[PDB]
Every structure is written in structure tokens, then in C-alpha cells.
Amino acid sequence: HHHHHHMVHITLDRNTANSWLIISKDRRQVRMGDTHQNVSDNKERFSNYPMVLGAQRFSSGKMYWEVDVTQKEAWDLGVCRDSVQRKGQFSLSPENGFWTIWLWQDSYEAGTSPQTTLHIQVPPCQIGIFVDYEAGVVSFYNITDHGSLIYTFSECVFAGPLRPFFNVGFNYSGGNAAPLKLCPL
Ligand SMILES: CC1(C)CN(c2ncccc2F)C[C@@H]1O
């Protein structure tokens, strides 16, 4: 792909984070803590899952960023509406305002309803995410495999400002402690 020139500098929004997440000083890395991180509750925090939003809001244009997923067993990545549900249980779907892919139990799937199997020969260590607001497109790229396409959501109905979306996943196994990292431009 040739989307690198739309690169944007994403930072994480501490106020949206699940209360167990630990965000680095530079707001570029996030990981699951082994306990509550001693923050107050607020209506923005994701309560049920280890999720956080980017601070940036997008309502036009073309945007590109990259995320490092090295040594993780489970994660979700993509974009979502600014007005997604924060509290309680929900599924990641375009109907609920999410355009995401994930790793879970050694398989990769796109967050359609129902979910779509992805075909990845080279497990990615870094994911590229491309958003074309006007076209209604969210695309995912395998940076480890020379930028090969993973998945394209087209005919997207964003219906609001978009935010970068992250889920570090649970660490029930002891094998999923590694962080998500926003990779330099
Ligand atoms: C008392 C809070 C800090 C948490 N809260 C809620 N948390 C989970 C489910 C439903 C809620 F209304 C409302 C308010 O923002």
C-alpha cells in the first residue's frame, strides 16, 4: 500500500481507559495491570473490557497509523464512533459503531456481525490502519508481511466523529501481558 503519507500521531486518552490499564507517560503504549490502577470512575471509562480510545477525533480526510502487537495472544484494534457504549456487555460490530479486527485463540477475525475469518500466513507483529472518512473505508495491513492487505470494511456508515480504538485483552493465561504500542512515523 501507499497510505504512509497520511500518517497521524495518535495518543491514548487516559480518561477513557478501563481502570486496570497502565498508559505510558508519552501516551503511546498501554498494557493490562495486575490490579485496579487507583483512578476514579467516570462515564467515559470502558467498564467490562480492557479498552481505551485515542484522543484524536476524525470527521474528514484520510488517516493512517501503526500499532505493535508483538507477543500478544489476544487484542482488538480499529476505529469506533465517539458515542459507542462504554458500560456493560456489547459486541464489536458496525451496528454498534465499531470497525475492528482481532486476534483470539490463534485465529484472526474481522468484527462484522457475524464475524469474518481472516487469512493470515505471516502472523503480524505490527498492524497498519487506514481510514478514508469520505469514502467510508477502514483497511488493515500486515506490516510484517510487506504491507499485505488483511481486511477492508467498505460502505461504512460512520454516523459521527471517529476515534482510534484499542483492546489489550485479558491476561487469564499469563501469556498476554505485553503492551499495545503506537509505532513511530
Ligand atoms: C457511576 C458511574 C461513574 C459509572 N456508571 C455506570 N457504570 C456502569 C454501568 C452503568 C453506569 F451508569 C455511571 C457513572 O458514570
Side-chain angles (χ1 to χ4, degrees), residues 1-184:
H1 72 84
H2 301 290
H3 302 309
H4 305 90
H5 59 113
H6 301 299
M7 183 69 82
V8 292
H9 185 79
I10 300 306
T11 61
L12 297 172
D13 183 349
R14 305 190 159 281
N15 282 341
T16 67
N18 177 277
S19 61
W20 286 46
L21 295 183
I22 302 171
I23 291 171
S24 61
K25 178 157 52 180
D26 66 4
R27 295 181 315 105
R28 300 276 281 171
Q29 308 192 18
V30 58
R31 67 186 180 90
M32 188 52 163
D34 284 332
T35 192
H36 187 294
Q37 293 306 130
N38 202 35
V39 292
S40 61
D41 208 359
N42 71 52
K43 62 200 192 179
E44 299 177 68
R45 294 199 188 290
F46 289 98
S47 61
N48 288 46
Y49 312 105
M51 295 168 177
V52 61
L53 307 185
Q56 290 71 37
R57 282 48 147 17
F58 303 123
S59 283
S60 64
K62 294 174 179 184
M63 286 70 56
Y64 179 75
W65 63 96
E66 293 182 356
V67 185
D68 195 301
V69 301
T70 298
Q71 190 53 21
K72 293 191 66 57
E73 297 175 346
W75 50 262
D76 316 323
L77 286 173
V79 292
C80 64
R81 295 187 186 138
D82 60 351
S83 57
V84 293
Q85 178 185 346
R86 307 306 169 84
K87 309 303 183 179
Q89 293 170 98
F90 55 87
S91 45
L92 297 177
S93 63
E95 303 101 277
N96 288 341
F98 298 92
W99 298 267
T100 63
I101 67 170
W102 64 72
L103 173 62
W104 170 251
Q105 303 189 163
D106 201 33
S107 83
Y108 301 90
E109 299 175 324
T112 55
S113 185
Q115 72 260 36
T116 302
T117 298
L118 301 172
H119 297 98
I120 296 188
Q121 180 59 22
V122 177
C125 298
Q126 298 90 33
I127 300 292
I129 302 175
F130 177 67
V131 180
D132 183 336
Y133 198 100
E134 276 63 39
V137 169
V138 183
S139 293
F140 297 82
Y141 298 92
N142 184 343
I143 302 319
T144 306
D145 183 44
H146 312 282
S148 56
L149 180 70
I150 296 171
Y151 192 81
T152 293
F153 289 91
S154 70
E155 316 191 274
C156 299
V157 179
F158 297 135
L162 293 173
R163 296 182 69 178
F165 174 78
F166 309 84
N167 187 354
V168 298
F170 294 101
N171 189 26
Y172 295 110
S173 64
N176 198 37
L180 294 176
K181 308 189 189 170
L182 283 154
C183 311

PDB file of all heavy atoms in Angstrom, residues 2 7 9 16-17 39 42-43 50 68 78 83 98-99 102 110 112 115 137 151 158 160 163 181 184:
ATOM      1  N   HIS A   2       0.276   2.387  -0.382  1.00  0.00           N
ATOM      2  CA  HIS A   2       0.928   3.717  -0.484  1.00  0.00           C
ATOM      3  C   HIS A   2       0.190   4.746   0.396  1.00  0.00           C
ATOM      4  O   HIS A   2       0.098   5.913  -0.031  1.00  0.00           O
ATOM      5  CB  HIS A   2       1.036   4.091  -1.980  1.00  0.00           C
ATOM      6  CG  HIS A   2       1.828   3.092  -2.773  1.00  0.00           C
ATOM      7  ND1 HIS A   2       3.205   2.937  -2.624  1.00  0.00           N
ATOM      8  CD2 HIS A   2       1.452   2.179  -3.698  1.00  0.00           C
ATOM      9  CE1 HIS A   2       3.635   1.980  -3.423  1.00  0.00           C
ATOM     10  NE2 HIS A   2       2.580   1.506  -4.100  1.00  0.00           N
ATOM     11  N   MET A   7      -0.002   9.478   7.514  1.00  0.00           N
ATOM     12  CA  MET A   7       0.368   9.151   8.911  1.00  0.00           C
ATOM     13  C   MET A   7      -0.107  10.260   9.849  1.00  0.00           C
ATOM     14  O   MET A   7       0.094  11.491   9.573  1.00  0.00           O
ATOM     15  CB  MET A   7       1.884   8.977   9.036  1.00  0.00           C
ATOM     16  CG  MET A   7       2.401   8.560  10.423  1.00  0.00           C
ATOM     17  SD  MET A   7       1.973   6.842  10.942  1.00  0.00           S
ATOM     18  CE  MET A   7       3.246   5.907  10.105  1.00  0.00           C
ATOM     19  N   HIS A   9      -0.202  11.206  14.248  1.00  0.00           N
ATOM     20  CA  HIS A   9       0.404  10.908  15.563  1.00  0.00           C
ATOM     21  C   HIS A   9      -0.729  10.689  16.562  1.00  0.00           C
ATOM     22  O   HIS A   9      -1.454  11.625  16.906  1.00  0.00           O
ATOM     23  CB  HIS A   9       1.288  12.064  16.009  1.00  0.00           C
ATOM     24  CG  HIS A   9       2.040  11.808  17.271  1.00  0.00           C
ATOM     25  ND1 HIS A   9       3.184  11.047  17.302  1.00  0.00           N
ATOM     26  CD2 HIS A   9       1.773  12.175  18.544  1.00  0.00           C
ATOM     27  CE1 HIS A   9       3.633  10.999  18.548  1.00  0.00           C
ATOM     28  NE2 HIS A   9       2.778  11.683  19.332  1.00  0.00           N
ATOM     29  N   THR A  16     -10.591   7.585  29.137  1.00  0.00           N
ATOM     30  CA  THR A  16     -11.471   6.576  28.537  1.00  0.00           C
ATOM     31  C   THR A  16     -11.058   5.170  28.960  1.00  0.00           C
ATOM     32  O   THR A  16     -11.791   4.200  28.676  1.00  0.00           O
ATOM     33  CB  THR A  16     -11.488   6.646  26.998  1.00  0.00           C
ATOM     34  OG1 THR A  16     -10.212   6.273  26.464  1.00  0.00           O
ATOM     35  CG2 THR A  16     -11.980   8.012  26.550  1.00  0.00           C
ATOM     36  N   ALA A  17      -9.882   5.031  29.549  1.00  0.00           N
ATOM     37  CA  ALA A  17      -9.281   3.695  29.792  1.00  0.00           C
ATOM     38  C   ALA A  17     -10.068   2.915  30.841  1.00  0.00           C
ATOM     39  O   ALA A  17     -10.420   3.488  31.908  1.00  0.00           O
ATOM     40  CB  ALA A  17      -7.868   3.854  30.240  1.00  0.00           C
ATOM     41  N   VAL A  39      -7.493   4.915  39.995  1.00  0.00           N
ATOM     42  CA  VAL A  39      -8.152   6.089  39.348  1.00  0.00           C
ATOM     43  C   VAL A  39      -9.628   6.166  39.775  1.00  0.00           C
ATOM     44  O   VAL A  39     -10.207   5.126  40.073  1.00  0.00           O
ATOM     45  CB  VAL A  39      -8.035   6.007  37.811  1.00  0.00           C
ATOM     46  CG1 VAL A  39      -6.594   6.184  37.345  1.00  0.00           C
ATOM     47  CG2 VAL A  39      -8.629   4.718  37.268  1.00  0.00           C
ATOM     48  N   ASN A  42     -15.571   7.196  35.945  1.00  0.00           N
ATOM     49  CA  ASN A  42     -16.204   8.283  35.165  1.00  0.00           C
ATOM     50  C   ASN A  42     -17.016   7.644  34.041  1.00  0.00           C
ATOM     51  O   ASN A  42     -16.919   6.399  33.801  1.00  0.00           O
ATOM     52  CB  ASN A  42     -15.225   9.339  34.691  1.00  0.00           C
ATOM     53  CG  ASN A  42     -14.313   8.843  33.590  1.00  0.00           C
ATOM     54  OD1 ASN A  42     -14.797   8.322  32.593  1.00  0.00           O
ATOM     55  ND2 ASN A  42     -13.040   8.941  33.744  1.00  0.00           N
ATOM     56  N   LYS A  43     -17.888   8.412  33.423  1.00  0.00           N
ATOM     57  CA  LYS A  43     -18.846   7.851  32.448  1.00  0.00           C
ATOM     58  C   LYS A  43     -18.124   7.470  31.140  1.00  0.00           C
ATOM     59  O   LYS A  43     -18.737   6.700  30.376  1.00  0.00           O
ATOM     60  CB  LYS A  43     -19.931   8.884  32.111  1.00  0.00           C
ATOM     61  CG  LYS A  43     -19.383  10.138  31.470  1.00  0.00           C
ATOM     62  CD  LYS A  43     -20.250  11.392  31.517  1.00  0.00           C
ATOM     63  CE  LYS A  43     -19.662  12.436  30.587  1.00  0.00           C
ATOM     64  NZ  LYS A  43     -20.480  13.674  30.558  1.00  0.00           N
ATOM     65  N   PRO A  50     -10.773  -4.520  28.680  1.00  0.00           N
ATOM     66  CA  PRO A  50      -9.552  -3.716  28.767  1.00  0.00           C
ATOM     67  C   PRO A  50      -9.281  -2.783  27.563  1.00  0.00           C
ATOM     68  O   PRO A  50      -8.273  -2.871  26.890  1.00  0.00           O
ATOM     69  CB  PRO A  50      -8.416  -4.769  28.932  1.00  0.00           C
ATOM     70  CG  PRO A  50      -9.140  -6.075  29.159  1.00  0.00           C
ATOM     71  CD  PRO A  50     -10.458  -5.934  28.464  1.00  0.00           C
ATOM     72  N   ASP A  68       1.964  -1.830  17.269  1.00  0.00           N
ATOM     73  CA  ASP A  68       2.816  -3.007  17.567  1.00  0.00           C
ATOM     74  C   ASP A  68       2.043  -3.940  18.470  1.00  0.00           C
ATOM     75  O   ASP A  68       1.520  -3.477  19.531  1.00  0.00           O
ATOM     76  CB  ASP A  68       4.139  -2.582  18.227  1.00  0.00           C
ATOM     77  CG  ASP A  68       5.177  -3.709  18.223  1.00  0.00           C
ATOM     78  OD1 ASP A  68       4.914  -4.736  18.769  1.00  0.00           O
ATOM     79  OD2 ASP A  68       6.143  -3.639  17.413  1.00  0.00           O
ATOM     80  N   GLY A  78      -8.861  -1.037  15.887  1.00  0.00           N
ATOM     81  CA  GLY A  78      -9.558  -0.390  14.753  1.00  0.00           C
ATOM     82  C   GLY A  78      -9.945   1.038  15.087  1.00  0.00           C
ATOM     83  O   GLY A  78      -9.135   1.800  15.640  1.00  0.00           O
ATOM     84  N   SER A  83     -19.406   8.044  20.140  1.00  0.00           N
ATOM     85  CA  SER A  83     -20.557   7.795  21.048  1.00  0.00           C
ATOM     86  C   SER A  83     -20.821   6.301  21.337  1.00  0.00           C
ATOM     87  O   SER A  83     -21.897   5.966  21.815  1.00  0.00           O
ATOM     88  CB  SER A  83     -21.779   8.443  20.499  1.00  0.00           C
ATOM     89  OG  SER A  83     -22.040   7.977  19.226  1.00  0.00           O
ATOM     90  N   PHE A  98     -18.424   0.107  15.695  1.00  0.00           N
ATOM     91  CA  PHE A  98     -17.007  -0.344  15.704  1.00  0.00           C
ATOM     92  C   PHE A  98     -16.589  -0.957  14.360  1.00  0.00           C
ATOM     93  O   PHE A  98     -17.395  -1.786  13.823  1.00  0.00           O
ATOM     94  CB  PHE A  98     -16.771  -1.438  16.770  1.00  0.00           C
ATOM     95  CG  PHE A  98     -17.036  -0.983  18.185  1.00  0.00           C
ATOM     96  CD1 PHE A  98     -18.283  -1.161  18.753  1.00  0.00           C
ATOM     97  CD2 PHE A  98     -16.036  -0.496  19.001  1.00  0.00           C
ATOM     98  CE1 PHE A  98     -18.558  -0.737  20.050  1.00  0.00           C
ATOM     99  CE2 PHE A  98     -16.292  -0.107  20.297  1.00  0.00           C
ATOM    100  CZ  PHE A  98     -17.540  -0.263  20.828  1.00  0.00           C
ATOM    101  N   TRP A  99     -15.385  -0.618  13.895  1.00  0.00           N
ATOM    102  CA  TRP A  99     -14.747  -1.188  12.680  1.00  0.00           C
ATOM    103  C   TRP A  99     -13.391  -1.722  13.109  1.00  0.00           C
ATOM    104  O   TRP A  99     -12.431  -0.949  13.241  1.00  0.00           O
ATOM    105  CB  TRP A  99     -14.690  -0.159  11.538  1.00  0.00           C
ATOM    106  CG  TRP A  99     -16.073   0.277  11.110  1.00  0.00           C
ATOM    107  CD1 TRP A  99     -16.847  -0.245  10.120  1.00  0.00           C
ATOM    108  CD2 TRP A  99     -16.869   1.322  11.721  1.00  0.00           C
ATOM    109  NE1 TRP A  99     -18.089   0.361  10.110  1.00  0.00           N
ATOM    110  CE2 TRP A  99     -18.117   1.333  11.060  1.00  0.00           C
ATOM    111  CE3 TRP A  99     -16.648   2.233  12.764  1.00  0.00           C
ATOM    112  CZ2 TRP A  99     -19.148   2.210  11.451  1.00  0.00           C
ATOM    113  CZ3 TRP A  99     -17.667   3.099  13.123  1.00  0.00           C
ATOM    114  CH2 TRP A  99     -18.891   3.078  12.481  1.00  0.00           C
ATOM    115  N   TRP A 102      -9.421  -8.555  15.168  1.00  0.00           N
ATOM    116  CA  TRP A 102      -8.872  -9.098  16.427  1.00  0.00           C
ATOM    117  C   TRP A 102      -8.127 -10.390  16.204  1.00  0.00           C
ATOM    118  O   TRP A 102      -8.276 -11.101  15.200  1.00  0.00           O
ATOM    119  CB  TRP A 102      -9.953  -9.268  17.459  1.00  0.00           C
ATOM    120  CG  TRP A 102     -11.014 -10.238  17.162  1.00  0.00           C
ATOM    121  CD1 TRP A 102     -10.911 -11.594  17.165  1.00  0.00           C
ATOM    122  CD2 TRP A 102     -12.381  -9.900  16.931  1.00  0.00           C
ATOM    123  NE1 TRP A 102     -12.141 -12.134  16.976  1.00  0.00           N
ATOM    124  CE2 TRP A 102     -13.068 -11.134  16.852  1.00  0.00           C
ATOM    125  CE3 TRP A 102     -13.082  -8.699  16.852  1.00  0.00           C
ATOM    126  CZ2 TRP A 102     -14.434 -11.186  16.599  1.00  0.00           C
ATOM    127  CZ3 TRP A 102     -14.439  -8.762  16.674  1.00  0.00           C
ATOM    128  CH2 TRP A 102     -15.095  -9.980  16.571  1.00  0.00           C
ATOM    129  N   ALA A 110     -12.351 -10.441  11.484  1.00  0.00           N
ATOM    130  CA  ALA A 110     -12.903  -9.087  11.377  1.00  0.00           C
ATOM    131  C   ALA A 110     -14.213  -9.016  12.142  1.00  0.00           C
ATOM    132  O   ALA A 110     -15.055  -9.949  12.101  1.00  0.00           O
ATOM    133  CB  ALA A 110     -13.134  -8.708   9.928  1.00  0.00           C
ATOM    134  N   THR A 112     -17.195  -8.027  11.893  1.00  0.00           N
ATOM    135  CA  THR A 112     -18.527  -7.978  11.289  1.00  0.00           C
ATOM    136  C   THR A 112     -19.527  -8.728  12.163  1.00  0.00           C
ATOM    137  O   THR A 112     -19.116  -9.411  13.097  1.00  0.00           O
ATOM    138  CB  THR A 112     -18.400  -8.561   9.900  1.00  0.00           C
ATOM    139  OG1 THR A 112     -17.810  -9.887   9.952  1.00  0.00           O
ATOM    140  CG2 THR A 112     -17.560  -7.753   8.968  1.00  0.00           C
ATOM    141  N   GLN A 115     -18.948 -12.481  12.756  1.00  0.00           N
ATOM    142  CA  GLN A 115     -17.509 -12.228  12.499  1.00  0.00           C
ATOM    143  C   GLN A 115     -17.022 -12.982  11.252  1.00  0.00           C
ATOM    144  O   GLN A 115     -17.585 -14.044  10.909  1.00  0.00           O
ATOM    145  CB  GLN A 115     -16.631 -12.512  13.716  1.00  0.00           C
ATOM    146  CG  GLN A 115     -16.457 -13.965  14.065  1.00  0.00           C
ATOM    147  CD  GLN A 115     -17.364 -14.356  15.201  1.00  0.00           C
ATOM    148  OE1 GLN A 115     -18.498 -13.882  15.331  1.00  0.00           O
ATOM    149  NE2 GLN A 115     -16.868 -15.272  16.013  1.00  0.00           N
ATOM    150  N   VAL A 137     -14.356   3.925   4.248  1.00  0.00           N
ATOM    151  CA  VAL A 137     -13.415   2.760   4.167  1.00  0.00           C
ATOM    152  C   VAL A 137     -12.550   2.712   5.428  1.00  0.00           C
ATOM    153  O   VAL A 137     -11.980   3.739   5.834  1.00  0.00           O
ATOM    154  CB  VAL A 137     -12.530   2.867   2.921  1.00  0.00           C
ATOM    155  CG1 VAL A 137     -11.383   1.838   2.977  1.00  0.00           C
ATOM    156  CG2 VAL A 137     -13.389   2.701   1.683  1.00  0.00           C
ATOM    157  N   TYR A 151      -7.791  -6.809   5.680  1.00  0.00           N
ATOM    158  CA  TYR A 151      -9.259  -6.680   5.572  1.00  0.00           C
ATOM    159  C   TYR A 151      -9.610  -5.240   5.225  1.00  0.00           C
ATOM    160  O   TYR A 151      -8.963  -4.303   5.738  1.00  0.00           O
ATOM    161  CB  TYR A 151      -9.953  -7.025   6.917  1.00  0.00           C
ATOM    162  CG  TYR A 151     -11.441  -7.190   6.797  1.00  0.00           C
ATOM    163  CD1 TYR A 151     -12.005  -8.380   6.331  1.00  0.00           C
ATOM    164  CD2 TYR A 151     -12.302  -6.167   7.148  1.00  0.00           C
ATOM    165  CE1 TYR A 151     -13.364  -8.492   6.135  1.00  0.00           C
ATOM    166  CE2 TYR A 151     -13.661  -6.276   6.963  1.00  0.00           C
ATOM    167  CZ  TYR A 151     -14.191  -7.447   6.485  1.00  0.00           C
ATOM    168  OH  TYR A 151     -15.531  -7.613   6.208  1.00  0.00           O
ATOM    169  N   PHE A 158     -20.279   5.695   9.227  1.00  0.00           N
ATOM    170  CA  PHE A 158     -19.599   6.138  10.467  1.00  0.00           C
ATOM    171  C   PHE A 158     -20.628   6.798  11.396  1.00  0.00           C
ATOM    172  O   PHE A 158     -20.655   6.505  12.607  1.00  0.00           O
ATOM    173  CB  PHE A 158     -18.382   6.971  10.117  1.00  0.00           C
ATOM    174  CG  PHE A 158     -17.304   6.236   9.350  1.00  0.00           C
ATOM    175  CD1 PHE A 158     -16.690   6.807   8.245  1.00  0.00           C
ATOM    176  CD2 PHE A 158     -16.877   4.979   9.786  1.00  0.00           C
ATOM    177  CE1 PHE A 158     -15.699   6.131   7.553  1.00  0.00           C
ATOM    178  CE2 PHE A 158     -15.875   4.307   9.092  1.00  0.00           C
ATOM    179  CZ  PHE A 158     -15.259   4.909   8.011  1.00  0.00           C
ATOM    180  N   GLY A 160     -20.847   9.700  12.732  1.00  0.00           N
ATOM    181  CA  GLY A 160     -20.295  10.524  13.816  1.00  0.00           C
ATOM    182  C   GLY A 160     -18.798  10.685  13.692  1.00  0.00           C
ATOM    183  O   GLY A 160     -18.168  10.038  12.802  1.00  0.00           O
ATOM    184  N   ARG A 163     -12.869   7.732  16.566  1.00  0.00           N
ATOM    185  CA  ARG A 163     -11.701   7.675  17.457  1.00  0.00           C
ATOM    186  C   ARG A 163     -10.940   6.377  17.234  1.00  0.00           C
ATOM    187  O   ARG A 163     -11.557   5.327  17.069  1.00  0.00           O
ATOM    188  CB  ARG A 163     -12.150   7.829  18.911  1.00  0.00           C
ATOM    189  CG  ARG A 163     -12.770   9.208  19.143  1.00  0.00           C
ATOM    190  CD  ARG A 163     -13.204   9.501  20.547  1.00  0.00           C
ATOM    191  NE  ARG A 163     -12.017   9.614  21.368  1.00  0.00           N
ATOM    192  CZ  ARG A 163     -12.069   9.911  22.659  1.00  0.00           C
ATOM    193  NH1 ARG A 163     -13.223  10.186  23.220  1.00  0.00           N
ATOM    194  NH2 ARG A 163     -10.958   9.959  23.359  1.00  0.00           N
ATOM    195  N   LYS A 181       1.556  -0.874  21.375  1.00  0.00           N
ATOM    196  CA  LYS A 181       2.419   0.331  21.257  1.00  0.00           C
ATOM    197  C   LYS A 181       2.089   1.031  19.954  1.00  0.00           C
ATOM    198  O   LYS A 181       2.172   0.377  18.885  1.00  0.00           O
ATOM    199  CB  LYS A 181       3.914  -0.004  21.312  1.00  0.00           C
ATOM    200  CG  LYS A 181       4.391  -0.841  22.475  1.00  0.00           C
ATOM    201  CD  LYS A 181       5.921  -0.933  22.547  1.00  0.00           C
ATOM    202  CE  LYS A 181       6.421  -1.925  23.573  1.00  0.00           C
ATOM    203  NZ  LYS A 181       7.886  -2.124  23.416  1.00  0.00           N
ATOM    204  N   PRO A 184       6.378   4.672  15.798  1.00  0.00           N
ATOM    205  CA  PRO A 184       6.771   5.957  15.262  1.00  0.00           C
ATOM    206  C   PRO A 184       6.585   5.964  13.746  1.00  0.00           C
ATOM    207  O   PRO A 184       6.743   4.911  13.118  1.00  0.00           O
ATOM    208  CB  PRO A 184       8.243   6.098  15.699  1.00  0.00           C
ATOM    209  CG  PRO A 184       8.719   4.697  15.975  1.00  0.00           C
ATOM    210  CD  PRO A 184       7.491   3.925  16.406  1.00  0.00           C
TER     211      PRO A 184
END
